[PDB]
Coordinates of C-alpha atoms in Angstrom, one line a residue:
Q1 CA -0.1 -0.2 0.1
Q2 CA 3.1 2.2 0.5
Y3 CA 5.3 1.8 -2.6
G4 CA 8.8 2.9 -3.1
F5 CA 12.2 2.7 -4.9
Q6 CA 15.6 2.1 -4.5
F7 CA 18.9 0.6 -6.3
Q8 CA 21.9 -1.1 -5.3
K9 CA 25.4 -0.1 -6.9
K10 CA 27.3 -3.2 -8.3
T11 CA 30.5 -3.7 -9.9
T12 CA 31.5 -5.5 -12.9
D13 CA 35.1 -6.0 -12.6
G14 CA 33.7 -8.0 -9.8
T15 CA 35.7 -5.5 -7.3
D16 CA 33.5 -4.5 -3.7
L17 CA 33.5 -1.0 -2.8
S18 CA 34.6 1.0 0.0
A19 CA 32.3 4.0 1.4
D20 CA 35.3 6.1 0.2
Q21 CA 34.8 5.9 -3.5
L22 CA 30.7 6.1 -2.5
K23 CA 31.5 9.6 -1.6
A24 CA 31.6 10.7 -5.3
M25 CA 28.9 8.2 -6.1
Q26 CA 25.7 10.1 -6.8
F27 CA 22.1 9.4 -8.2
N28 CA 19.0 11.5 -8.8
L29 CA 15.4 10.5 -9.0
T30 CA 13.1 12.7 -11.0
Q31 CA 9.4 12.8 -11.5
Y32 CA 8.1 14.0 -14.7
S33 CA 5.3 15.8 -15.4
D34 CA 3.7 14.3 -18.1
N35 CA 3.7 10.4 -19.7
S36 CA 6.1 12.1 -22.2
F37 CA 9.1 12.0 -20.2
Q38 CA 10.1 15.6 -21.7
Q39 CA 9.7 17.9 -18.6
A40 CA 10.9 17.2 -15.0
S41 CA 8.0 17.9 -11.6
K42 CA 10.6 17.6 -9.0
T43 CA 14.0 15.9 -8.6
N44 CA 16.0 14.7 -5.6
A45 CA 19.2 12.9 -5.1
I46 CA 18.8 9.5 -3.4
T47 CA 21.8 7.4 -1.5
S48 CA 22.2 3.3 -1.6
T49 CA 20.6 3.4 1.7
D50 CA 17.3 4.7 1.3
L51 CA 13.9 3.9 -0.3
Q52 CA 12.0 6.8 -1.8
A53 CA 8.1 6.5 -1.6
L54 CA 6.9 7.3 -4.8
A55 CA 3.2 8.2 -5.9
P56 CA 1.8 7.1 -8.9
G57 CA 3.7 8.7 -11.6
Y58 CA 6.4 9.3 -14.2
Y59 CA 9.9 8.5 -12.8
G60 CA 13.5 8.7 -13.9
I61 CA 16.7 7.6 -12.5
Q62 CA 20.3 8.3 -13.3
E63 CA 23.6 8.2 -11.8
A64 CA 24.9 11.9 -11.7
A65 CA 28.7 10.7 -10.2
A66 CA 30.1 7.1 -10.2
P67 CA 32.3 5.7 -7.3
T68 CA 35.7 7.5 -7.9
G69 CA 37.3 5.4 -10.7
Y70 CA 34.7 3.5 -12.0
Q71 CA 33.4 4.6 -15.2
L72 CA 30.0 6.7 -15.4
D73 CA 26.9 5.7 -17.1
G74 CA 24.5 8.8 -17.4
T75 CA 22.0 6.5 -18.8
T76 CA 18.3 7.6 -17.3
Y77 CA 16.1 4.9 -17.3
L78 CA 12.4 5.7 -17.5
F79 CA 9.8 4.2 -15.1
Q80 CA 6.4 4.3 -13.9
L81 CA 4.5 3.6 -10.9
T82 CA 0.7 3.0 -12.3
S83 CA -2.3 4.3 -10.1
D84 CA -3.4 0.5 -9.2
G85 CA 0.3 -0.2 -8.5
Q86 CA 1.9 -2.1 -11.4
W87 CA 5.5 -0.6 -12.3
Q88 CA 6.2 -0.4 -16.1
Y89 CA 9.0 1.0 -17.9
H90 CA 9.3 3.5 -20.6
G91 CA 12.9 3.1 -21.9
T92 CA 16.1 5.6 -21.5
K93 CA 16.4 9.2 -21.9
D94 CA 17.6 9.1 -25.2
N95 CA 14.6 5.8 -26.2
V96 CA 11.6 6.7 -24.7
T97 CA 9.1 3.7 -25.6
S98 CA 5.4 2.9 -24.8
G99 CA 6.0 1.0 -21.5
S100 CA 6.2 -2.1 -20.6
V101 CA 4.9 -4.1 -17.3
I102 CA 8.2 -5.1 -15.3
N103 CA 7.0 -8.2 -14.2
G104 CA 9.5 -9.7 -11.5
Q105 CA 13.0 -8.7 -13.2
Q106 CA 13.6 -6.7 -16.3
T107 CA 17.1 -6.4 -17.6
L108 CA 18.0 -2.8 -19.3
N109 CA 21.5 -1.9 -21.1
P110 CA 24.6 -4.2 -21.1
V111 CA 27.2 -2.4 -18.9
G112 CA 30.3 -4.5 -20.5
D113 CA 30.0 -8.0 -19.6
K114 CA 26.7 -7.0 -17.2
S115 CA 23.5 -5.4 -17.7
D116 CA 21.3 -3.5 -15.0
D117 CA 18.3 -4.5 -14.6
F118 CA 14.7 -3.8 -12.9
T119 CA 13.3 -6.0 -10.1
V120 CA 9.9 -5.9 -8.3
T121 CA 10.9 -6.9 -4.6
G122 CA 8.7 -6.9 -1.9
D123 CA 5.0 -8.7 -0.4
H124 CA 2.8 -6.9 -2.6
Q125 CA 5.3 -6.1 -5.4
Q126 CA 5.6 -2.4 -4.2
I127 CA 9.1 -2.3 -4.2
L128 CA 11.0 -1.5 -7.2
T129 CA 14.8 -1.7 -7.5
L130 CA 17.1 -1.0 -10.2
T131 CA 20.6 -2.4 -10.0
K132 CA 23.5 -0.6 -11.8
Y133 CA 26.9 -1.7 -12.5
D134 CA 30.1 0.2 -12.9
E135 CA 32.5 -0.2 -15.3
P136 CA 36.1 0.3 -13.8
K137 CA 38.0 2.8 -15.2
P138 CA 41.0 1.5 -17.3
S139 CA 44.8 1.2 -15.2
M140 CA 48.1 1.9 -16.5
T141 CA 51.8 -0.3 -16.0
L142 CA 55.0 1.2 -15.1
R143 CA 58.0 -0.3 -16.9
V144 CA 61.5 -0.1 -16.1
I145 CA 64.6 -0.5 -18.6
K146 CA 68.1 0.0 -16.6
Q147 CA 71.3 0.3 -18.4
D148 CA 75.1 0.6 -17.9
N149 CA 77.1 3.4 -19.8
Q150 CA 78.4 0.9 -22.6
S151 CA 74.6 0.4 -23.8
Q152 CA 74.4 -3.0 -22.5
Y153 CA 71.4 -4.4 -20.2
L154 CA 72.3 -4.1 -16.5
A155 CA 70.2 -5.7 -13.9
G156 CA 70.4 -5.3 -9.9
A157 CA 69.3 -2.1 -10.1
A158 CA 66.2 -1.2 -7.9
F159 CA 63.6 1.7 -8.1
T160 CA 60.6 2.0 -5.4
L161 CA 57.5 3.3 -6.8
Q162 CA 55.9 5.4 -3.4
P163 CA 52.2 6.3 -4.1
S164 CA 50.8 9.3 -3.0
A165 CA 48.6 7.3 -0.8
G166 CA 49.2 3.6 -0.5
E167 CA 52.4 1.5 0.3
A168 CA 55.7 1.6 -1.8
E169 CA 56.6 -1.4 -4.3
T170 CA 60.2 -2.0 -5.4
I171 CA 61.3 -4.2 -8.0
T172 CA 65.0 -4.8 -8.9
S173 CA 66.1 -4.5 -12.7
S174 CA 66.4 -7.4 -14.9
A175 CA 68.8 -6.7 -17.8
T176 CA 65.8 -7.6 -20.7
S177 CA 65.1 -6.2 -23.8
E178 CA 61.4 -6.4 -22.4
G179 CA 62.5 -4.6 -18.8
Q180 CA 60.3 -4.9 -15.9
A181 CA 57.0 -4.2 -14.7
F182 CA 55.6 -3.2 -11.3
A183 CA 52.4 -5.1 -10.5
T184 CA 51.1 -2.5 -9.1
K185 CA 49.0 -1.1 -11.5
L186 CA 48.7 3.0 -11.9
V187 CA 45.1 3.9 -11.5
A188 CA 43.4 6.6 -12.6
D189 CA 43.6 10.1 -11.3
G190 CA 46.2 8.5 -8.9
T191 CA 49.3 10.4 -8.1
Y192 CA 52.7 8.1 -7.2
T193 CA 56.7 8.9 -7.2
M194 CA 59.7 6.5 -7.8
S195 CA 63.3 6.4 -8.1
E196 CA 66.0 4.1 -7.8
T197 CA 66.2 2.2 -3.9
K198 CA 69.1 1.1 -4.7
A199 CA 72.3 1.6 -7.1
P200 CA 73.4 -1.1 -9.1
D201 CA 76.7 -3.1 -7.7
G202 CA 79.3 -1.3 -10.3
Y203 CA 77.3 1.9 -10.8
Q204 CA 76.8 5.6 -8.9
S205 CA 73.7 6.5 -7.3
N206 CA 70.7 7.9 -8.9
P207 CA 68.9 11.1 -7.3
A208 CA 65.8 12.3 -9.2
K209 CA 62.3 10.8 -8.4
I210 CA 59.8 10.9 -11.0
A211 CA 56.7 11.2 -9.8
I212 CA 53.9 10.4 -12.5
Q213 CA 50.2 11.8 -12.1
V214 CA 47.5 9.8 -13.9
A215 CA 44.8 11.4 -15.7
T216 CA 41.0 10.6 -15.1
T217 CA 40.7 8.8 -17.9
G218 CA 43.4 6.3 -16.7
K219 CA 44.5 6.3 -20.2
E220 CA 47.5 9.0 -20.1
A221 CA 49.5 10.2 -18.0
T222 CA 51.8 13.2 -16.8
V223 CA 55.2 12.4 -15.7
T224 CA 58.2 14.6 -14.3
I225 CA 61.4 13.6 -13.2
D226 CA 62.8 16.1 -10.5
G227 CA 59.8 18.3 -10.9
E228 CA 60.5 18.7 -14.6
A229 CA 58.2 17.8 -17.6
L230 CA 59.4 15.0 -19.8
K231 CA 57.9 13.7 -23.3
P232 CA 57.9 10.1 -24.4
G233 CA 61.3 9.8 -26.2
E234 CA 63.0 12.8 -24.4
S235 CA 65.7 12.0 -21.6
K236 CA 66.3 13.7 -18.3
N237 CA 68.9 12.5 -15.8
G238 CA 69.4 9.2 -17.5
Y239 CA 65.9 8.2 -17.9
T240 CA 64.2 8.1 -21.2
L241 CA 59.9 8.1 -21.4
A242 CA 58.2 5.5 -23.6
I243 CA 54.7 5.7 -23.7
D244 CA 52.6 2.4 -25.4
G245 CA 49.0 3.0 -24.8
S246 CA 48.6 1.9 -21.3
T247 CA 52.4 1.4 -20.5
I248 CA 54.5 3.7 -18.9
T249 CA 58.2 2.7 -19.8
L250 CA 61.3 4.1 -17.8
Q251 CA 64.8 3.4 -19.6
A252 CA 67.5 4.6 -17.4
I253 CA 71.8 4.7 -17.8
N254 CA 73.8 4.4 -14.9
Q255 CA 77.4 5.5 -15.1
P256 CA 80.1 3.5 -13.3
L257 CA 81.4 4.8 -9.5
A258 CA 84.0 7.3 -9.9
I259 CA 86.9 5.6 -8.9
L260 CA 89.8 8.0 -7.4
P261 CA 93.7 6.6 -7.0
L262 CA 95.6 6.2 -3.7

């Protein structure tokens, strides 16, 4: 007798989410003036916690901000609560349709692997629940090529990447054509730093820290060495920048230690 609406927010990658990203996550529920869905009456934000009790009428639910690091789906699904208590689905905002009863569960539009649905929960079929999924924003990897003064591949060199917020992770150079990669992927609009953790046996120290701040896209980055901007194919302090889509590659040349004589 007292009908309502709520959504649960799921994930495609399978990752469950903490409340810290849910800070960003924002959803809005609109009530339209006409069955046309063309002009809003009242629109109010709604959280994952709530149920809005809904009067018979035409309504729209759309994610306004995705949880931090997951991709935004600004689809606005469109439904109606009929005066006799039935629920019905009208489409997206970009595809308004003549209205279907939502019989148990209605699958909506796919999100990568998955598809969002409406499900009519409740004893008197009187709670309508939307399940929205969120595609994780793409990551990005860090690669190290470490070389001697003689352009021969060098191993034993170690670099630690110190994430702005997070635990540092360190790898030791392998003298391989294909270099060495950090397991710790660089997440979109995340800020990190790294230098050499320990100089290789025969070679001098390397002072410059490289600080890499990834775009919100997570498909591009800005990397600066000791605060100085560098570009792929350019070399500052014995580091060379090489970007292959999601991959960031550092080839570093090490000089041998100065050996002064007795």
